[PDB]
Write a protein that binds this DNA or RNA. Sequence first.
RNA 1: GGGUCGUUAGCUCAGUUGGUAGAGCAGUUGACUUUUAAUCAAUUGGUCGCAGGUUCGAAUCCUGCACGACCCACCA
RNA 2: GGAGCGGUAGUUCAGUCGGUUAGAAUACCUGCCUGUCACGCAGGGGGUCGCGGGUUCGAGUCCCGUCCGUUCCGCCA
RNA 3: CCUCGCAAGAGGUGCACAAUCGACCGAUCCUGAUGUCUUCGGAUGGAUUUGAGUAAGAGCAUAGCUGUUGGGACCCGAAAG
RNA 4: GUCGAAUUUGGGUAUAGGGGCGAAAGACUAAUCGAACCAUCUAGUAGCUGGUUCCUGCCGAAGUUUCCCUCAGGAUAGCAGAAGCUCGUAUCAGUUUUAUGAGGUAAAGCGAAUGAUUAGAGGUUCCGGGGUCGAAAUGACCUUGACCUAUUCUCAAACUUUAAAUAUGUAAGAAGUCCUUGUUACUUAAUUGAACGUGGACAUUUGAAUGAAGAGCUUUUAGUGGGCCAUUUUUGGUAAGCAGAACUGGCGAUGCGGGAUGAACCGAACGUAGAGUUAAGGUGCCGGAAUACACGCUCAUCAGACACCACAAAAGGUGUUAG
RNA 5: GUGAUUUCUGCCCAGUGCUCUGAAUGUCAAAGUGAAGAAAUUCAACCAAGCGCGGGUAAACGGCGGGAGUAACUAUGACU
RNA 6: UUGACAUUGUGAAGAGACAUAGAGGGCUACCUUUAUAGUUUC
RNA 7: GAAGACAUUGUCAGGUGGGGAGUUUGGCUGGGGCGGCACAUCUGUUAAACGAUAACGCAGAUGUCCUAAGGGGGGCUCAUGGAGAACAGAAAUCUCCAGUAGAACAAAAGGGUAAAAGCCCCCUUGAUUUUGAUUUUCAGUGUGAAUACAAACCAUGAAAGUGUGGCCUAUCGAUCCUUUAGUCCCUCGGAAUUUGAGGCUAGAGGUGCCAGAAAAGUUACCACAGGGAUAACUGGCUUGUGGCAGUCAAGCGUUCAUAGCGACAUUGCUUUUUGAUUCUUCGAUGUCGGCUCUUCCUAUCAUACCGAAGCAGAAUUCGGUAA
RNA 8: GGUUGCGGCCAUAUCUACCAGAAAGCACCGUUUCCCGUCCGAUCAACUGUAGUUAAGCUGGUAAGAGCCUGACCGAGUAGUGUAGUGGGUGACCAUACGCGAAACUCAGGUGCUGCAAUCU
Lengths: 105, 58, 52, 159, 220
Amino acid sequence: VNVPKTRKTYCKGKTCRKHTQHKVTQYKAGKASLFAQGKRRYDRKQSGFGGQTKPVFHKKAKTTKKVVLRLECVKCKTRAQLTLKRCKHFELGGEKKQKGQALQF
Amino acid sequence: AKSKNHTAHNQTRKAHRNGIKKPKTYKYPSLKGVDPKFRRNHKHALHGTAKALAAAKK
Amino acid sequence: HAKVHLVAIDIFTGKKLEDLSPSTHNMEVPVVKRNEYQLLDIDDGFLSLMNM
Amino acid sequence: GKSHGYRSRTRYMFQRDFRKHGAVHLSTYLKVYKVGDIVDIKANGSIQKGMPHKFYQGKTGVVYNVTKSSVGVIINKMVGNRYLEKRLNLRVEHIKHSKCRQEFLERVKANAAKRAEAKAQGVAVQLKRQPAQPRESRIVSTEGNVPQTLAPVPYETFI
Amino acid sequence: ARRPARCYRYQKNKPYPKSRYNRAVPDSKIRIYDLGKKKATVDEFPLCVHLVSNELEQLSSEALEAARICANKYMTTVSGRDAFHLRVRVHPFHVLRINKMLSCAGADRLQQGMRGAWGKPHGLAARVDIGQIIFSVRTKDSNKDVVVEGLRRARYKFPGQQKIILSKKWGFTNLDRPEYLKKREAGEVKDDGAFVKFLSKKGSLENNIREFPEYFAAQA
RNA sequence: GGGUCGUUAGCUCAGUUGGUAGAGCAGUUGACUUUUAAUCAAUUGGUCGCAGGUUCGAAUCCUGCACGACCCACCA
RNA sequence: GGAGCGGUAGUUCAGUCGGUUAGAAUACCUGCCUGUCACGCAGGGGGUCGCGGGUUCGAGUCCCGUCCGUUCCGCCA
RNA sequence: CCUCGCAAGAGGUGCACAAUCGACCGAUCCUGAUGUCUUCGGAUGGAUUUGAGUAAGAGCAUAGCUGUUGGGACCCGAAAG
RNA sequence: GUCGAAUUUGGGUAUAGGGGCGAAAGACUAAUCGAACCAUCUAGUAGCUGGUUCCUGCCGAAGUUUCCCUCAGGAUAGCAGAAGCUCGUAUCAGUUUUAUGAGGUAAAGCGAAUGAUUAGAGGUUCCGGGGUCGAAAUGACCUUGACCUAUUCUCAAACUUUAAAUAUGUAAGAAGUCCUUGUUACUUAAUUGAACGUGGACAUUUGAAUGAAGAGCUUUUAGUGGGCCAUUUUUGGUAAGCAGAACUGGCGAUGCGGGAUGAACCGAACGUAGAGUUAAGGUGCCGGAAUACACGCUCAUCAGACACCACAAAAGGUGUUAG
RNA sequence: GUGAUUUCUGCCCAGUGCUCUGAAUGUCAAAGUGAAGAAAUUCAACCAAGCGCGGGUAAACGGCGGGAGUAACUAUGACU
RNA sequence: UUGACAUUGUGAAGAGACAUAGAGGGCUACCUUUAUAGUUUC
RNA sequence: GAAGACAUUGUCAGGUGGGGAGUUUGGCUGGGGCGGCACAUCUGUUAAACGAUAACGCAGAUGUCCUAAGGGGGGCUCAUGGAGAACAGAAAUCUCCAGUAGAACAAAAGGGUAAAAGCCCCCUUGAUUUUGAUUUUCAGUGUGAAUACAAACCAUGAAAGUGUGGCCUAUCGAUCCUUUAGUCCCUCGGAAUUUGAGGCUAGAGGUGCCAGAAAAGUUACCACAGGGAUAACUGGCUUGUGGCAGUCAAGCGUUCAUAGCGACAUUGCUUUUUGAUUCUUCGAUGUCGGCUCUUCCUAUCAUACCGAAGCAGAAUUCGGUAA
RNA sequence: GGUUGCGGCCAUAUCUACCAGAAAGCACCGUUUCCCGUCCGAUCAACUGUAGUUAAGCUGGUAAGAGCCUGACCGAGUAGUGUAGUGGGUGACCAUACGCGAAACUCAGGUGCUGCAAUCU
């Protein structure tokens, strides 16, 4: 689905506590990194013999992912999340619908 | 292994052995999930009306 | 427990490939769409396509 | 497979009833609900918000809480061995007043009056409703109205 | 071809018509539900006999066909084709189903016992009651001795026993014979094609004039 | 042995899923040619082997019917 | 006794499962070449995408039914 | 239990217990006062919030039926490793 | 069968177990081989079989719910017990009454919508074709073809105006009603409402019947979680002593009288005896009991004989009887 | 692997293997190298063999099709 | 099987890659192209 | 002698590696498999008029879609038919009349909807933040979905109000781990600072076997535990199918329904075929045939006595008593 | 009693085809500078009750009208159904007792009532 890049939603950040302009960006998990205990704990278990110690997942049934909108409040640059129902298409940009015009040839 | 799937047979006959005991209600029911505003108001009312009977009637 | 041996010729590369698996377990299916582009002049090694 | 939605098997339950479609009439809304009053629950398909579950169609119970456009009603649902006390949140459009309770209240009102009358008489009332007592010894009157004698009637084809 | 009608005799299941759920059926065998003088003004044929079914049961299309044809041929060869106006007062809507198994040695490719047991359609049939009427006839009152023998012949081609009673009332319409005569000689009838229309004391009195000039005037 | 399907003009083929038969080949007749053949055109031949209902009426619907063509046939 | 597949100019087939267009080869037709036919040269038409219904801005491809043909199973006794 | 009542009853006190509305203690989310190495500090006041709480302690140790768990675990019983 | 050699064999000697040897059969390896043997780990493990040791007394089930790599199992709730605790005629009751709610099934209905459908009548067309009358015509007239009007015969698990019976919710008051008036940070234009109250009244028909071998309340734990038959309702199925449900009853778990016999049918449920009375069934004899009483029907060179239940059909017959 | 002699062993290198005295900077570990950072470390290029890209090989495993029309009776179809 | 480090030593050349300068090119990344004080990979 | 800091050897690293090792291979399932999913869900019907309900019962549907198809207001009335207007025709645009909904509401099906929830316009983010309470499926846990509220801060409207997603019923996920958001808060436990890491509250990344394991075959060499809960032989009930018999009688039979036949229909019987079933047997009833030998049954091939004949004789047909 | 504004119930009020309406009431009807909105002063906006009507609307009446309603020993104790029987029936089913009880049809009767405020010969 289409959503617009702007959204005047509620903001909680001490000074705000009211409805303000947010900049609406797609969440993306970023890098996973070592040094997390849960990674180290894994690596240590892995090392040596036995081989694959932990369950590797296979049976995927979902095609899509649920979408998350990282919002940034323009005033205090304090952020917040918002999650939608699932979908295949997505565009955080514009291109709004036209009312009832003719089909493209 | 085609086993019997479901029935409600001989269930009522279990039920009536101890037998559908009713809720057993109390005067002064539990104000839980009653309007918050109302509850707040009633609180203050009770606080006040206690005072009236406590301080005056002696 | 019946297996299935497919033979499939690539869309892109073109080579002739085969597989054999029991048929319940999934072979994950790619998703396909046509862009119906209109082709203007072909420049250098690329083509040049015009969406309507 | 099997299916059990929130409106499972409710084709004819929330049917709007013949030639009474639409436009939720306005007595409904001005009927004033006091706390601890008994109310019947006729669901109303012409309003979707605040609807009851199918189980509570025709079921009756006590109001416990009020709000802006709704009422909290308690009912005794039957489950397994026991009665469990529920807490619904029905919009006012699905509710009417218990007529029977009103009737009862009227009876009580009469009772006080009867007691008062008795007092100015000098006690002795008999106020409970006794059932249909086995009707008394009486004398009938023939005078003109003679026993109009009947007989059995013979079998006839007419088909 | 066709398992005996003993299977589908009694009303063991619910009714099951040719609907938006059940289609691609077998077509009914009995097509012609009337015969004889089908453009017969009712003032021609005063008699009637009904072929009344005594028992609550179903009737296959075939049975209704064979019977109809039997009664038909026995009338027309004897009395003459315009001596009568034989209707059938029942239509086969209810459908029959069959599972259908393999015959000579089905052991390995068996179609699995009682699995997927819901059958495809088989043949159409009419649901029938105690005292319910199969076949009208209506003739001249002298012609009774023909129809009585025809219906007699035809009843043999049905499941169970179904009796052959004698009606009154210029029998296709309602309204008894002498009463009908009274209505006629009073002028309370217009001879609508095939079947008779009747006067009323309801509709606006303008449209009872052009339809019925007779009833109220002193002429007739 | 049984279930299914088909039997059409001298021979073959559509038949329309119910009101008059279409097309090819064959035969005859004319055109053409010095004769012919090939070709071109025109005609001749049709109750679809026998019953019952019959849509006004049926080879074409259905069921019987005799000659073919398919599909099936103990068991351990 | 069931499951899956096929369906298009006169023929073999793409198109088609992507819905707001029917393409190839051969055959057919016309003119040309040639003493005449073939080959060739230059042009031309021809398919309600088997039938019937439905969904659809639009169905040939989307769904359901006959319809005619091709495949798969018929294992343990 | 006391009081009055010849008794019937009435009135007072009402443990344990049951329901409830409050008070407090902690976490949460607000509030932020007097003071302030001017970033510390936390008063008081709140809240459809929540805790296995306090609200004049009820525990500990041995012993007996019972039921659980780990154990050769009611007894016998593999194919195996 | 082969019998001069790819021969047969003695002794010595070599190869050792998931290893050997194998002119290959998974053959052979001390009667063991699709992985020897002996000991130990080991009393391995077993949601599966088998058994599981004295008497009496009391109470006495389930085979259903939800979850599980669950479908022979377990958790779970339910049923059952034992321990009691708090009170002492409470407030309740597999029930009726009076009252009032909801329901969309059996029925009915379709000249009422929704569809399904038999027939003709009359209209209609310039707004469908095929004809005759005409060079043509928003033409003179027939044949159909749909439409329209009034009628017709027929229908429906997934159609309905209508609409039962049976089952079903709630009230039948002390925690009530009224009169006066207090509370508040809620609400009101308003000490109006609001919920909660002190005070005063109204009680022995305190507000329908009948019943209450006490009422309520907590603990804990066993077995169970394969069911089955019968009346009626009912889905698949040609049908089944088949399969699957609905409401009660049974049987499992239960003997006794009667169904000759039979788990479930009828009768009726058992402490040990005597008496008397019957239930269901019977009463020629085998059996205890009337070869009782009364009115009739039947002649069977295939009689008939009492439910569940051990069969019978469509069709006939001046055999007979009555209408 | 086949299985005396005789006679013969056709076509297929796409798949799967096997193989190549085979190019390249596609993929590329560890160490080593460079940058950044207070350092842990982060990021980078470089990059073995293989994998990939191409070449060979079938007494290697193996495999080796449909549908129409057409001869001057009918049929059949060298021929298309 | 291949790589790295260790085994672990003595030398000689000849070439490539990183940093500064000069040219012939499609303000400008690079592309081909010579030279310098150092290091390094062969 | 060769060979030379190369090999060889050691340690790490990537490849290769059924040669070998361990393990594996789901459930439901009128036996198993093959087939489906009835395994998470939703609609209508089955369902037996509250709810509750089964089957591999019936007809369908879901893993999406939508910054508007959400939210508020305003304006208007839809499908269809009638009658008309250059090109205009079954349909292109317009206009009046009728028009209870025969339309349109993102998508199945059922509800619901008429100054509307439908269409056109206007302004917008309530598809927002904090945390409860509640209903549904229920164990009264979860998950999902929903309802009524509060306390905020907004939306729109003149206002009354209405709005915490899509008119309503489906549209979707636990632990651990990673990641983000927030409070910029608490810990690194000898003390600090800064990196790093770990905590808290709210989400995301997925388990469709959908209350959530990382998993391919084969056995005719097989094995163990069990199973009549369950197949294959018999027996049983049942009959579709098989066989056999009627009743009716259109037609055949030159003429003529029934000498002999006998369509379309129809009511049976049979346990000799095959199926359908799973009650009995899986600590085993020896499972096809042929041989051999006994009886039994007729639904009568022949033989005895008969009647019927489309019986002149002969032959042959139909029937009756007869095993 | 009529009529207006606001209603409650929601057709005993709606629909078809006609005819009556004095008083006031609405009602149509006159006009576009301003506020306002339309393709268009039709719609809605504003300005005039002045320039004109009862033609429509609205109200009321009429019709053996449709429809709707209300009741009836009207059908009909009809179907249908709860309870019981070692009741009948080869069965399908039917009768019996204790009870409960419809729809169509037929007939007759009705065709809005009424609250709040204002106003009318």
